[PDB]
Amino acid sequence: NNLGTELDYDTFCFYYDWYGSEAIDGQYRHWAHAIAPDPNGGSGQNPGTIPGTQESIASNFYPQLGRYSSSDPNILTKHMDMFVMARTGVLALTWWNEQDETEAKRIGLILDAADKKKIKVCFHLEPYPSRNVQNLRENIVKLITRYGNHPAFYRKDGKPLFFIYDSYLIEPSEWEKLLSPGGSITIRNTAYDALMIGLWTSSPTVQRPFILNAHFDGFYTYFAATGFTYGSTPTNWVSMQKWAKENGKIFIPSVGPGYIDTRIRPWNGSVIRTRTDGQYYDAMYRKAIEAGVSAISITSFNEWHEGSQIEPAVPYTSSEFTYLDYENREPDYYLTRTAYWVGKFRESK
Ligand SMILES: OC[C@H]1C[C@H](O)[C@@H](O)[C@@H](O[C@H]2O[C@H](CO)[C@@H](O)[C@H](O)[C@H]2O)[C@@H]1O
């Protein structure tokens, strides 16, 4: 078929599976959330907590699906239909190495639901406690072993793909051991080889040698807020792509529809980026496409705390908070606008 509706498997949407309900999880997990103290605001702050009641959730927006559980199979079905509407073929699943049966169950449910709609799943490896290249290897082995034969497990030209958040926290000399073909604990040429996509944060003077010396296959930028880092400043993307091409690296810029996290970080207002009825998203997605990249990542499907979500949101005013909403646009606007951009990306490939 040539309908302009098919999934794109070089489009990765960052997905969070940490939401709970009292009924399913024992707690409205993540809808309830601690409020972060101001890191520049002195001692003895008692910032408090958002209780995750119907009226007061840990987001500046309000989900169309309500305070949902990430383990609810019926929610997962709806999310996969949303991925189909957005044409986003890869669900890039946040992975915190919880080592608990509830995590394992949820990952299986997500893979199962994804496969029903031909969506693929890859893992976004977060900075879990004591993360290092040895336990990372062990975890990559575990994930490929447990999930690699699941029909929804993502591969690109035969290789799994992992995004590594905060990869800069680990020295290139450690990364080399895992990611150079000669490394002491290499994954190259093994059953556990993968495309490893590191998080490019700061200036080229720092990031170029890091990426090369660490033997990453590519890099992404994550932040939905333009200008938050060098990497998340879209006017740098043409030059970042030129360098990537010259050095055999895969650049996967991250685009998002906006940013606001002031319910959980009231002091962080400088990072707010207004949605302007979709115009912010359009501008950022256009820059990614114009850079001539082979793959794009979307921050985010459902990081509700950071207000970067494309998942449908609805107007809501409670006694406790007046939520933001998609304003003049309908709740599914960011899904259908993502589909539009996936089309213009495919037209460019
Ligand atoms: O996925 C990468 C990164 C993206 C966002 O900054 C957060 O999801 C962050 O997690 C931390 O901040 C969350 C609040 O937004 C908090 O709920 C988590 O517990 C933190 O680990 C992700 O690492």
Side-chain angles (χ1 to χ4, degrees), residues 16 18 30 33 96 124 126 165 222 264-265 303 305-306:
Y16 294 82
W18 55 26
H30 270 260
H33 200 287
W96 282 98
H124 186 191
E126 299 278 6
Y165 191 86
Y222 190 76
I264 61 149
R265 306 186 188 110
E303 223 298 12
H305 310 309
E306 294 192 343

Short mmCIF file of all heavy atoms in Angstrom, two decimals, residues 16 18 30 33 96 124 126 165 222 264-265 303 305-306, ligand 1:
data_model
loop_
_atom_site.label_atom_id
_atom_site.label_comp_id
_atom_site.label_asym_id
_atom_site.label_seq_id
_atom_site.Cartn_x
_atom_site.Cartn_y
_atom_site.Cartn_z
N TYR A 16 6.86 6.28 28.76
CA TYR A 16 7.06 6.11 30.20
C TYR A 16 5.98 5.17 30.72
O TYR A 16 4.80 5.33 30.42
CB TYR A 16 7.04 7.50 30.89
CG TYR A 16 8.24 8.27 30.41
CD1 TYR A 16 8.21 8.95 29.20
CD2 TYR A 16 9.44 8.25 31.10
CE1 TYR A 16 9.33 9.56 28.70
CE2 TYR A 16 10.57 8.88 30.60
CZ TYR A 16 10.50 9.53 29.40
OH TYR A 16 11.62 10.14 28.83
N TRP A 18 5.57 4.24 34.09
CA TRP A 18 5.66 4.35 35.54
C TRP A 18 4.37 4.85 36.22
O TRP A 18 4.37 5.12 37.41
CB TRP A 18 6.85 5.21 35.91
CG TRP A 18 6.91 6.60 35.30
CD1 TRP A 18 5.88 7.39 34.87
CD2 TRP A 18 8.10 7.37 35.14
NE1 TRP A 18 6.37 8.60 34.43
CE2 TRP A 18 7.72 8.61 34.60
CE3 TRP A 18 9.45 7.14 35.42
CZ2 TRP A 18 8.65 9.61 34.33
CZ3 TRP A 18 10.37 8.12 35.14
CH2 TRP A 18 9.97 9.34 34.60
N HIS A 30 3.14 7.98 40.35
CA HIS A 30 3.60 9.06 39.47
C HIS A 30 2.58 10.18 39.29
O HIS A 30 2.97 11.34 39.25
CB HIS A 30 4.22 8.54 38.16
CG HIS A 30 5.69 8.31 38.27
ND1 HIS A 30 6.60 9.22 37.80
CD2 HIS A 30 6.41 7.30 38.81
CE1 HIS A 30 7.83 8.77 38.04
NE2 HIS A 30 7.74 7.62 38.67
N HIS A 33 3.49 12.70 43.22
CA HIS A 33 4.92 12.94 43.00
C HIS A 33 5.42 14.00 43.98
O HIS A 33 4.72 14.98 44.26
CB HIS A 33 5.13 13.41 41.56
CG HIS A 33 6.52 13.25 41.02
ND1 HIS A 33 7.57 14.04 41.41
CD2 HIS A 33 6.99 12.46 40.03
CE1 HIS A 33 8.65 13.72 40.71
NE2 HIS A 33 8.32 12.77 39.85
N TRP A 96 14.37 1.47 33.93
CA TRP A 96 15.00 1.88 35.18
C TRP A 96 15.61 0.74 35.98
O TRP A 96 16.09 0.96 37.10
CB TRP A 96 14.00 2.64 36.05
CG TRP A 96 13.84 3.98 35.59
CD1 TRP A 96 12.85 4.44 34.81
CD2 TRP A 96 14.73 5.08 35.81
NE1 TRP A 96 13.02 5.76 34.56
CE2 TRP A 96 14.18 6.19 35.16
CE3 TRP A 96 15.93 5.25 36.53
CZ2 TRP A 96 14.78 7.44 35.17
CZ3 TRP A 96 16.54 6.50 36.54
CH2 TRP A 96 15.96 7.58 35.86
N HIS A 124 15.15 2.47 26.36
CA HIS A 124 15.81 3.72 26.70
C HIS A 124 16.42 3.50 28.08
O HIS A 124 15.71 3.52 29.10
CB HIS A 124 14.78 4.83 26.70
CG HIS A 124 15.32 6.20 26.89
ND1 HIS A 124 14.50 7.29 27.13
CD2 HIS A 124 16.59 6.69 26.83
CE1 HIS A 124 15.25 8.38 27.20
NE2 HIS A 124 16.51 8.05 27.01
N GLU A 126 18.06 4.13 31.34
CA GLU A 126 18.16 5.25 32.22
C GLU A 126 19.33 5.10 33.19
O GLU A 126 19.89 4.00 33.31
CB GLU A 126 16.84 5.38 33.01
CG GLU A 126 15.64 5.62 32.11
CD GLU A 126 15.45 7.07 31.71
OE1 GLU A 126 16.30 7.91 32.03
OE2 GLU A 126 14.41 7.35 31.07
N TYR A 165 20.50 7.25 28.21
CA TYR A 165 20.35 8.56 28.81
C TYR A 165 21.54 8.83 29.73
O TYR A 165 22.02 7.92 30.42
CB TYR A 165 19.03 8.67 29.56
CG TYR A 165 18.72 10.07 29.97
CD1 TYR A 165 18.09 10.93 29.12
CD2 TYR A 165 19.13 10.58 31.20
CE1 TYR A 165 17.85 12.24 29.47
CE2 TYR A 165 18.89 11.89 31.55
CZ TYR A 165 18.25 12.72 30.66
OH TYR A 165 18.00 14.04 30.99
N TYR A 222 17.44 14.31 23.22
CA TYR A 222 16.36 14.20 24.21
C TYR A 222 15.52 15.45 24.48
O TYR A 222 14.31 15.42 24.32
CB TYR A 222 16.81 13.57 25.55
CG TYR A 222 15.59 13.29 26.39
CD1 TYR A 222 14.76 12.20 26.11
CD2 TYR A 222 15.17 14.19 27.36
CE1 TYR A 222 13.57 12.00 26.79
CE2 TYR A 222 13.98 13.98 28.05
CZ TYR A 222 13.19 12.89 27.76
OH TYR A 222 12.00 12.72 28.44
N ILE A 264 5.88 20.07 39.38
CA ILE A 264 6.86 19.32 40.17
C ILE A 264 8.17 20.06 40.43
O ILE A 264 8.89 19.71 41.37
CB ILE A 264 7.17 17.90 39.62
CG1 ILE A 264 7.76 17.91 38.20
CG2 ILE A 264 5.91 17.05 39.67
CD1 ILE A 264 8.71 16.76 37.96
N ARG A 265 8.46 21.09 39.60
CA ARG A 265 9.67 21.90 39.75
C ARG A 265 9.28 23.38 39.63
O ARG A 265 9.54 24.01 38.58
CB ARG A 265 10.73 21.50 38.71
CG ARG A 265 11.10 20.01 38.69
CD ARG A 265 12.26 19.67 37.75
NE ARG A 265 12.45 18.21 37.62
CZ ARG A 265 12.19 17.47 36.53
NH1 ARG A 265 11.74 18.01 35.41
NH2 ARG A 265 12.40 16.15 36.56
N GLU A 303 5.59 11.86 28.94
CA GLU A 303 6.27 12.41 30.10
C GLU A 303 5.41 13.60 30.57
O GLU A 303 5.62 14.76 30.23
CB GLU A 303 7.71 12.81 29.81
CG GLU A 303 8.69 12.41 30.93
CD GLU A 303 8.43 13.05 32.29
OE1 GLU A 303 7.36 13.65 32.49
OE2 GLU A 303 9.29 12.91 33.21
N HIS A 305 4.98 14.78 33.52
CA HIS A 305 5.61 15.67 34.49
C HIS A 305 6.29 16.83 33.81
O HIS A 305 6.32 17.93 34.33
CB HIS A 305 6.64 14.96 35.37
CG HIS A 305 6.17 13.69 35.99
ND1 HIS A 305 4.99 13.58 36.70
CD2 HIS A 305 6.72 12.46 35.98
CE1 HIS A 305 4.86 12.33 37.11
NE2 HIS A 305 5.90 11.63 36.68
N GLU A 306 6.85 16.56 32.63
CA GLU A 306 7.64 17.57 31.92
C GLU A 306 6.84 18.31 30.86
O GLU A 306 7.36 19.23 30.26
CB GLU A 306 8.93 16.94 31.41
CG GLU A 306 9.81 16.54 32.60
CD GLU A 306 11.23 16.17 32.24
OE1 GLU A 306 11.51 15.89 31.05
OE2 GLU A 306 12.06 16.13 33.17
O1 LIG B 1 13.97 9.72 30.07
C1 LIG B 1 15.05 10.59 30.45
C2 LIG B 1 14.70 11.56 31.58
C3 LIG B 1 13.57 12.43 31.06
C4 LIG B 1 12.94 13.34 32.07
O2 LIG B 1 13.82 14.40 32.46
C5 LIG B 1 12.57 12.56 33.32
O3 LIG B 1 11.60 11.61 32.92
C6 LIG B 1 13.77 11.81 33.91
O4 LIG B 1 13.40 11.09 35.10
C7 LIG B 1 13.61 11.86 36.30
O5 LIG B 1 12.67 12.93 36.47
C8 LIG B 1 11.31 12.50 36.60
C9 LIG B 1 10.38 13.70 36.68
O6 LIG B 1 10.24 14.29 35.39
C10 LIG B 1 11.16 11.66 37.84
O7 LIG B 1 9.80 11.22 37.95
C11 LIG B 1 12.11 10.47 37.75
O8 LIG B 1 12.00 9.72 38.95
C12 LIG B 1 13.54 10.94 37.52
O9 LIG B 1 14.43 9.85 37.33
C13 LIG B 1 14.34 10.84 32.88
O10 LIG B 1 15.53 10.20 33.37
#
